[PDB]
Amino acid sequence: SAYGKMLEELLGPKQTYESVTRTIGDIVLTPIRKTPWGWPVGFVIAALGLLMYLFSLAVLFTVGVGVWGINIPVAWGFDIINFVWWIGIGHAGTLISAILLLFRQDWRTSINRAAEAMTIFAVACAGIYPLVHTGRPWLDYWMLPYPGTLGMWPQFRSALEWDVFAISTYATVSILFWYLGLIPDLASLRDRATNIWVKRFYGFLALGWRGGARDWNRYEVASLILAGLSTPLVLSVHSIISLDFAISQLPGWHVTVFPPYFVAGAVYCGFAMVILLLVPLRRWYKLHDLITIKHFDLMGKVMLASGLVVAYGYFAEIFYAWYSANIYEYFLITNRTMGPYAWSYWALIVLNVAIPQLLWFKRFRVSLPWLFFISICINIGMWFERWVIIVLSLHRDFLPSSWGYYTPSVWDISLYAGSFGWFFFLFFLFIRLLPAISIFEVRDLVHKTETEKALA
């Protein structure tokens, strides 16, 4: 049937419930020192990247926030370009896990946890920059509302006060919706462990899951509503992060279309990171029977449906800069196209509007070497968008006597390139400790493929 021809393109040749469990119950529950190579010599490169993270933080806390090369015109440099970037990555991990659950689509089941757990670790590296770019990080509890023996409360008019309410909600909701999606799987890992103190570990995480006829109905409504709550959440988290630029009167920042273009940029850069992390998980970890090439064909289309709202945002920011008869937004066009950071706006149009237009053609989407090259070109390209928006619009603004440059210091590089350590330290821990791909959601779409094969 026409419905079976799209289900059979997401799974391998033949799969049963104990086969989809064994395929994921062998990437986990394999013994330590039987764990595959490339993980420990990938977890060490990730741990050495974490020692660069905790040392670029210990140098930042001790010496100051001014080891970053941030000037006074451009006080927001890599610390916020990488905050909006890292949180932008995490938004298309929930568009897979939560927004696609609204559309009841099934190409999300295999890429569910490898993107939902990708969100959290892209928030654990994005939730640190608003806690560390402050000059006095120890007083970051002042951005929280609490009766604190001095009548001051946070402002609730600035988007850095909505950030600590978006990032903290995005954290403790994409964690709970991720931990919700694990209690059935951690019950599969517990029942299949055959190792005391390993069965107890997953038996403690999967609280009492039990399966259950009614426990599954309460799950299907808790997972649907959480998916229906993480759809306006991530539509607002990178819209609130969008508003720490759009509530400022700066020329390149007060662009009103930032909310539906930062969200479109977060889904754009996020699917690039999902593809960058699944082509290795599909190749190295033998998950060819679960993460089929139709998942990348569709991720390349959703990464295209978002990349055209970004490539539209580059025009709704150029046109309405010109359409605004301001001297200061006319200059915005003649400061990005020309100017000292002209190459930033041209290593951006090339990397978001020229190179990733190949996602239109199935020749450049099914072919994973191109989808992996376009995803590299988007993650770098969507970093330059966050550099064009922040630094290229700050360093040349009103009052020409306040024009800086922001050459980033070594402690911006040794913190951003070390942030990938804290991302892969957790992402390699998640692969080894937890199922790197949903089990019951892949038990379904196997029960759904046999249910459709039953009629035909």
């Binding site: 015109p73 200061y328 009052l399 020409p400 024009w403 800086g404």
Partner: protein, 85 residues
């Protein structure tokens, strides 16, 4: 400890006969790059007159006192208004 090595001691170029200006200089650049920490940045009014220092001349000030005060209507402001009595 402050002015201990701020370079270019210009006193070692005088003559005591031409102590304030002399016309026997040979420049002959021997350097490539220096820091030269200046605070301003752009030294040009990038068309942003009327927001930067507005200039004129008394030739056109006696004939029109408000010759650079732009006549603009009361700008709309959604964000309330407070009184400072």
């Amino acid at each position: 400890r402050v002015g201990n090595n701020v370079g270019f001691n210009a006193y070692r170029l005088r003559t005591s006969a031409t102590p304030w200006f002399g016309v026997g200089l040979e420049v002959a650049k021997v350097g490539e790059n220096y820091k030269l920490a200046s605070t301003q940045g752009h030294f040009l009014m990038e068309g942003r007159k009327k927001d930067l220092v507005r200039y004129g001349t008394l030739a056109e000030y006696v004939e029109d006192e408000k010759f650079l005060q732009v006549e603009k209507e009361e700008p709309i402001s959604l964000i309330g208004e407070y009184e400072y009595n």
